[PDB]
Design a protein around this nucleic acid. Structure first.
Ligand SMILES: CN(CCO)c1ccc(/C=C(\C#N)c2ccc(C#N)cc2)cc1
Ligand SMILES: [Mg+2]
Ligand SMILES: [Mg+2]
Ligand code: NA
Lengths: 213, 224
RNA sequence: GGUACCUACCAAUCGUAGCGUGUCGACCAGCUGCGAAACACGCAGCUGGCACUGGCGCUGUAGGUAC
């Protein structure tokens, strides 16, 4: 089986930067290499075929080259719409092989998160569970630390985080941290707090509520 | 006007079977090579199988050899992928793809379908519970409010969440579903809005889970 | 006696009595262009084998035939 080792796995570049993405075939695949672009949730789109031929319709800033077993996709100047995951593929012999992919995200200035805290609705409480939500909105970069506190008791192992893809309008991220408790455990505590640490915050920001207010 | 449309995805149990179809329009499949390529959630593309024209010769990946069978009918411009002895690691979105013409785009896949989701799990289908995330009327600045909906305890993917039946879209963030320890999925869809409109604007979240044929609408408004 | 044709000339080596010749074509494998075409299949060109086809040129030994 012919393998295609793709690098890097990801990168954050600013508009106008040149980007190079390499794929190394385990053995010779002649020039039967293609490059594809995939937006999140959409089907891939053919960028390059035969290692270096530009598919009809693809802007000229995309280019592909071969040197032995090394294949390189170059975006001369990164446009804001080039946000995507790029994949290489060998079709020299069966079975075909895709690279692991390279996720290209867009850089931007640091943006602090807007923090919100949401207690569990009574409707849910009547079912025997309590979900407390902490929302971090419109921040950059993606790195952020969320810490839950119940009556100043550090929580761990009872929360889950989920992050959106970079927003196409402002290039920021949004994160949700959900803390799950039993109805009893919830109604036997008062102070519920979410502490957020992020690069664009001089000090951690805490949002909290007292159960019943 | 080339187009590929997949169908047949759904939920099945380990050891089960399922047949996906790929209907082509704008061209005849018998004159092109047809490929099936899969993508697991948050993972890279994986070539699954392919079938060549004129010969009908078929090729498969190592991880599906002996379990999957690719075929095609011309008197019904369609291709098919039968999957037997399905395993958990076969869960993914499956794309139908056309290999381009030899003298125009080499061996590149120039046309792809939208993809169809195949889930392989022993868990049972279940619709979500939609709870509100009410805007904090207590302690809220002018023009800065956040409200949302929590879609909890459902399986399998996907659920779609809209706001005001499609009218409200600016500032909406619907997070990717996370799998809970219970084996069920949960997510939240939030939206930011000026607080001045909190009392004079009714906010609806429309959640929909197709596998369970569940369609719920939840009003989100302050509390007490 | 001469010319022409014909029949035979150990073994091995394609063949031949022997020497040289590898042919429209046939077969094996490979490469390339093209056929809606990665494999298979069709058309064409080329490369290396092979000698199925056993022809062609030269040149004998006898026997025979014709003149
Ligand atoms: C160089 N050499 C010695 C060994 O390599 C050769 C040996 C034999 C040949 C054979 C032929 C030629 N040309 C041939 C064969 C059959 C027919 C028929 N019907 C026609 C011609 C060529 C060369
Ligand atoms: Mg002899
Ligand atoms: Mg012979
Ligand atoms: Na010949």
């Amino acid at each position: 089986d012919i393998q295609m080792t793709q690098s890097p796995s990801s990168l954050s570049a600013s508009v106008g930067d040149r980007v190079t993405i390499t794929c190394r075939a385990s053995q010779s695949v002649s020039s039967a290499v293609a490059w594809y672009q995939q937006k999140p949730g959409k089907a891939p789109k053919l960028l390059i075929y035969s290692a270096s031929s530009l598919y009809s319709g693809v802007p000229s800033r995309f280019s592909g080259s071969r040197s032995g077993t090394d294949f390189t996709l170059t975006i001369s100047s990164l446009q804001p719409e080039d946000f995507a995951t790029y994949y290489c593929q060998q079709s020299y012999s069966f079975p075909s092989t895709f690279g692991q992919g390279t996720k290209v995200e867009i850089k931007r200035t640091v943006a602090a998160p807007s923090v919100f805290i949401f207690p569990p609705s009574d409707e849910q409480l009547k079912s025997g569970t309590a979900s407390v939500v902490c929302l971090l909105n419109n921040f950059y970069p993606r790195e952020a630390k969320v810490q839950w506190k119940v009556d100043n008791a550090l929580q761990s192992g009872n929360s889950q985080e989920s992050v959106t893809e970079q927003d196409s309008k402002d290039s920021t991220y949004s994160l949700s941290s959900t803390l799950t408790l039993s109805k009893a455990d919830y109604e036997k505590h008062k102070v519920y707090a979410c502490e957020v640490t992020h690069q664009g915050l001089s000090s951690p920001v805490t949002k909290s509520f007292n159960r019943g207010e | 006007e080339v187009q590929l449309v997949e169908s047949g995805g759904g939920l099945v149990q380990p050891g089960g079977s399922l047949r996906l179809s790929c209907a082509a329009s704008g061209f005849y499949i018998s004159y092109s090579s047809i490929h099936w390529v899969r993508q697991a959630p948050g993972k890279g593309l994986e070539w699954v199988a392919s079938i060549s024209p004129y010969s009908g010769s078929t090729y498969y990946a190592d991880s599906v050899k002996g379990r999957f069978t690719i075929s095609a009918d011309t008197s019904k411009n369609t291709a098919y992928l039968q999957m037997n002895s399905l395993r958990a690691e076969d869960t993914a979105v499956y794309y139908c793809a056309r290999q381009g013409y030899r003298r125009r785009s080499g061996r590149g896949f120039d046309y792809w379908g939208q993809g169809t989701l195949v889930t392989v799990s022993s868990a049972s289908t279940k619709g979500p519970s939609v709870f509100p995330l009410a805007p904090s009327s207590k302690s809220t600045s002018g023009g800065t409010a956040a409200l949302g909906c929590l879609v909890k305890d459902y399986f399998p993917e996907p659920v779609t969440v809209s706001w005001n039946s499609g009218a409200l879209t600016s500032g909406v963030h619907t997070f990717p579903a996370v799998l809970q320890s219970s084996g069920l999925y949960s997510l939240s869809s939030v939206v930011t809005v000026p607080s001045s409109s909190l009392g004079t604007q009714t906010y609806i979240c429309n959640v929909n889970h197709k596998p369970s044929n569940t369609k719920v609408d939840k009003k989100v408004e302050p509390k007490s």
